[PDB]
Design a protein around this nucleic acid. Structure first.
Ligand SMILES: Nc1nc2[nH]cnc2c(=O)[nH]1
Ligand SMILES: Nc1nc2[nH]cnc2c(=O)[nH]1
Lengths: 338, 338
DNA sequence: TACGCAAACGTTTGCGT
DNA sequence: TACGCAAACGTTTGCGT
């Protein structure tokens, strides 16, 4: 312990503490001795003691949903990098969209007194929004809303709507008029918001999407698989499909292949997320890219701000998706007619 | 603070503390009052203060390598589940195989006084093994060695060698005699160990692998891509390939497709890991499955043990891979001749 | 019966001189 | 000059009675 170090050095703990944090000038001679002891005694200064006094843990908490999913996984790795460099420690929490679970992690977190909170819960019911407020005191930012549901947080917005729009536009411009869509959960932003952006372009083009052509997924490859199936497993099928998430796309690809349908020669498919290895899908996936690192870094930043420069007001920063052309889309029947 | 609660309740903090932890009988009347205050004052008992006294943080640290990679990602989600249920908090650390980085996280961790340490560093150079020892005092288990490199840790072993063997055997038994291999980094267990297990079966079958047929990868889809290419991009090519990791396999698939080679009609491919969505690769990947949840849970368990029942001796538990047949393998030229 | 007083956990940091 | 004494951070837990 520090006392033990001070003794081996025959200096006061104050001195020990000062040399360890260079918070005041100490003589070389003195300072070496301290180091010496620190070394033999093999000292590890306790963060708990420290945090207890200085009042901050240099530790931040990520209340996510799941961390296996490619999408999430990439964001997280991002956030960790940032924590690491500004010297923060990341406490990861998966709540699986479970309220109970969510109230639990929130609670352990406050208790562990994290400096700030990163939230990525996918769906926000009032009960959740409500819980979150009970912690306005701990600084936080939600990284997955589409607009700013609340006033007690910072927020980074992904313009998912404008992504939906881009996707649809692309298909339209490639000659397609018979399109289907497998969207992600409507209770989520990246679900509802992308569908909507997609539907605007359709309506702008006077394209009507037969309900038998829209099939809900859940971002999981299985959902993709079933959706595609149900789509192509029908009398009249579209020539192209907009799928709200790369991993589901992955699944949508498999099924087509399984029905002996050729992509994109038989069906064109466009995804969304540009997950780390969508380029190695077969065929190489054409998708909308979501800035995951920037989404992370930007979030970590507004937090640190609030944390460091004691900011009180809610902030919000937009971020922008962009189209990545790969090999899963092919001209439609109307390309030549424009 | 607790003092503030005790006052609103006109009871001593001792009482407050007792009702909060039911560590001694308190009158209903009394106990309600406490709760009352706890409620208005909106109390969050500090874990730091607590940990400071009781000496444990109910918090565990995962020093990993990377957390985006499918493989790792799944293990982690596993470990978190377990932390959650036994009431521990997970602190995630990616060191990217960086010594400096590794010494840093190790250090922050000790400092943060984590109850135990989960290690998954992929490669273990003496310099790393050395650092690790300096922390024998903090309980730990490495979850990725093939045998027990040290005596100061628990260890879970994956029998990766017997996986390599199974893979090769399969190919042999399907009629293949001309096989190639794209292995993972030899400095890693899941790299070296699987190759070796694979090479034993070959030698048992008197199959010789021409060096021009073995190409190192790094578990990253790109490495897979290049490897396959180099393989098929040659006068004489094998009829089948053993690829040391599903994600590289994913890449190996893409490239074949890109050369207009058909899988498995032109080349047979077998992977390794059985990552969550290898079934949706195209074609559905035939691979060796690695028990990731059990790998996690088992690790979390030996830790808790050491943690709770103050175990001093090094333990080691094996785990077992098993073959999953999917659609990426086809009979070889010698099937009929056996 | 049912509960309090006070010391301790390991630091940091104000004043001293 | 260059450094010490002692109080404080927010708890838990031993003895009391
Ligand atoms: N798995 C997954 N992928 C996504 N991509 C966009 N939103 C999501 C989500 O909630 N889950
Ligand atoms: N990405 C990745 N996959 C693996 N599968 C087995 N070992 C590894 C590894 O070190 N990295």
């Amino acid at each position: 312990t520090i006392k033990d170090v001070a003794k081996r050095a025959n200096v006061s703990t104050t001195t020990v503490s000062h040399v360890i944090n260079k918070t005041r000038f100490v003589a070389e001679e003195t300072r070496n001795a301290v180091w010496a002891a620190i070394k033999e005694l093999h000292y590890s200064p306790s963060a708990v003691a420290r945090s207890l006094k200085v009042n901050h843990t240099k530790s931040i908490g990520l209340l996510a949903t799941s961390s296996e999913a490619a999408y999430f996984a990439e964001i997280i790795e991002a956030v960790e990098k940032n924590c690491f460099q500004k010297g923060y420690t990341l406490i990861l929490g998966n709540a699986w969209n479970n309220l109970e679970k969510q109230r639990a992690y929130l609670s352990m977190m406050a208790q562990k007194r994290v400096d700030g909170l990163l939230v990525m819960c996918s769906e926000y019911p009032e009960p959740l929004l409500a819980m979150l407020e009970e912690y306005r005191h701990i600084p936080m930012v939600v990284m997955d809303w589409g607009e700013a549901k609340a006033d007690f947080t910072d927020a980074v917005i992904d313009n998912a709507f404008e992504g939906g729009y881009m996707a649809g536009r692309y298909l339209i411009e490639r000659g397609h008029r018979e399109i289907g869509v497998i969207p992600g959960p409507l209770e989520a932003n990246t679900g509802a918001g992308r569908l909507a952006g997609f539907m605007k372009a359709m309506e702008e083009a006077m394209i009507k999407v037969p309900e038998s052509w829209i099939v809900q997924g859940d971002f999981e490859p299985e959902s993709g698989y079933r959706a595609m199936q149900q789509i192509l497993s029908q009398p009249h099928r579209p020539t192209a499909v907009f799928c709200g998430g790369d991993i589901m796309a992955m699944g949508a690809l498999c099924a087509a292949d399984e029905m002996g349908l050729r992509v994109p020669q038989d069906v064109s498919l466009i995804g969304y997320d540009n997950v780390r290895n969508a380029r190695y899908f077969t065929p190489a996936l054409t998708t909308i890219h979501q800035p995951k690192d920037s989404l992370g870094e930007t979030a970590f930043n507004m937090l640190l701000d609030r944390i460091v420069n004691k900011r009180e007001e809610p902030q919000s920063i937009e971020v922008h998706p962009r189209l990545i052309e790969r090999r899963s889309v092919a001209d439609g029947p109307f390309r030549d007619y424009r």
